Design a protein around this ligand. Structure first.
Ligand code: F3C
Ligand code: DC
Ligand code: CL
Ligand code: MG
Ligand code: MG
Ligand code: NA
Ligand code: NA
Ligand code: NA
Length: 326
DNA sequence: CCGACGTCGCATCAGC
DNA sequence: GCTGATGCGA
DNA sequence: GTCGG
């Protein structure tokens, strides 16, 4: 990438603001600037050149000038030296430990991997599984493995009820050569925006995937969202595959296009597109696009019969999934 | 200057 | 138990 | 931290 040094610096700052400062809007600001610089097709020569991009303001322009001149950022060099920031940043790398819990753990003297394993009974269920698979969850998934996983999920879902449709979204649907996890959108004609004519629709799919030993652990689970752990089968004498994060989201079948737009992302693309919708007088979630009144209360859902219909309402040219990796 | 910043599912906890 | 924040996550 | 009214 042309500007990897700058974008890494801004990402590290984003993570600091989220994990340590607990400033979600600074986290989003830094990530938005990193994303716009990542797609800028020139090697940036100055902060002023970067400040022309939307999301890069005066402060980041100054950091870019320091980074270009020296190859580092004194603000980050100091953060890297702060023991509390180091501890908190490490603990938040466990799934289920966020900024609040990380700081509480540090207060209580729990700040290393050894400390965590020593104190499993101080972890909730999600955190306990996140610790169990700490190393695995930072490994990436080759697309070749994503395809094997897709095959298992799609075939097992079909065995439960041929009327299900499972769609792998996330970075996979954007065509990435590797993914951080597997995101599965699920629909069934019995579950629409108008009625739920059959119970346990998500449950019976999860159960089937547990039965064939694909799903191995559960982080959380409700009627429409599963968050868990899965693993490909290995062959005789083969080293096992890493355990992987899996998210499954059951979406009302008639709202598939809003659902698949949401679950395809990226997360920054969704923030950007939804923010553009609001400026255009609309609000978009994973179910609907609705107008806003002069009051600012959402109106009735608008007819959507393609992903492109959603782009049309907000006066955006259509962007294929591969062009949404912001 | 300064209010807004995307939107929502599940787990957990506090107040009643 | 319910309801509404809050945390953490997609 | 940045943007737009
Ligand atoms: N804050 C978020 C996080 C996720 N999402 C949506 C968009 C994501 O593309 C989708 C899956 O979340 P994810 O964290 O797995 O993101 P991916 O796009 O799949 C990443 F590229 P990765 O391949 O590392 O999972 O949920 C979102 O809307 N807002
Ligand atoms: N998980 C899914 C995927 C597609 N669909 C529907 C939405 C459209 O009517 C149609 C689109 O087919 P496809 O996008 O797979 O080419 O399938 C669904 O109901 N659930
Ligand atoms: Cl809605
Ligand atoms: Mg993903
Ligand atoms: Mg704005
Ligand atoms: Na700018
Ligand atoms: Na975490
Ligand atoms: Na995911």
């Amino acid at each position: 990438t042309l500007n990897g040094g700058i974008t890494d610096m801004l990402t590290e700052l984003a993570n600091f603001e989220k994990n340590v400062s607990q400033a979600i809007h600074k986290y989003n600001a830094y990530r938005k600037a990193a994303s716009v610089i990542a797609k800028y097709p020139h090697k940036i020569k100055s902060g002023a050149e970067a400040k022309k991009l939307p999301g890069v303001g005066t402060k980041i322009a100054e950091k870019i000038d320091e980074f270009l001149a020296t190859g580092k950022l004194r603000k980050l060099e100091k953060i890297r030296q702060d023991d509390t920031s180091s501890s908190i940043n490490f603990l938040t790398r466990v799934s289920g430990i966020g900024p609040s819990a990380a700081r509480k753990f540090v207060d209580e003297g729990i700040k290393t991997l050894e400390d965590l394993r020593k104190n499993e009974d101080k972890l909730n269920h999600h955190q306990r599984i996140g610790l169990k698979y700490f190393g695995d969850f930072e490994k990436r998934i080759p697309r070749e493995e994503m395809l094997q996983m897709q095959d298992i999920v799609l075939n097992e879902v079909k065995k439960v009820d041929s009327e299900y449709i499972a769609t792998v979204c996330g970075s996979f649907r954007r065509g990435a050569e590797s993914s951080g996890d597997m995101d599965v959108l699920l629909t069934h004609p019995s579950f629409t925006s108008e009625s739920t004519k059959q119970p346990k629709l998500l449950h019976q799919v999860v159960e089937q995937l547990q039965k064939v030993h694909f799903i191995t652990d559960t982080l959380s689970k409700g009627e429409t969202k599963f968050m868990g752990v899965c693993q490909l089968p290995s062959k005789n004498d083969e080293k096992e595959y890493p355990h992987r994060r899996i998210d499954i989201r059951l979406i009302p079948k008639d709202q598939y296009y809003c659902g698949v737009l949401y679950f395809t992302g990226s997360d920054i693309f969704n923030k950007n597109m939804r923010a553009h919708a609001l400026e255009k007088g609309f609000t978009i979630n994973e179910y609907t696009i609705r107008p806003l009144g002069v009051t600012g209360v959402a109106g009735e859902p608008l007819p959507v019969d393609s992903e492109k219909d959603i782009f049309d309402y907000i006066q955006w040219k259509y962007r294929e999934p591969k062009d949404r990796s912001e």
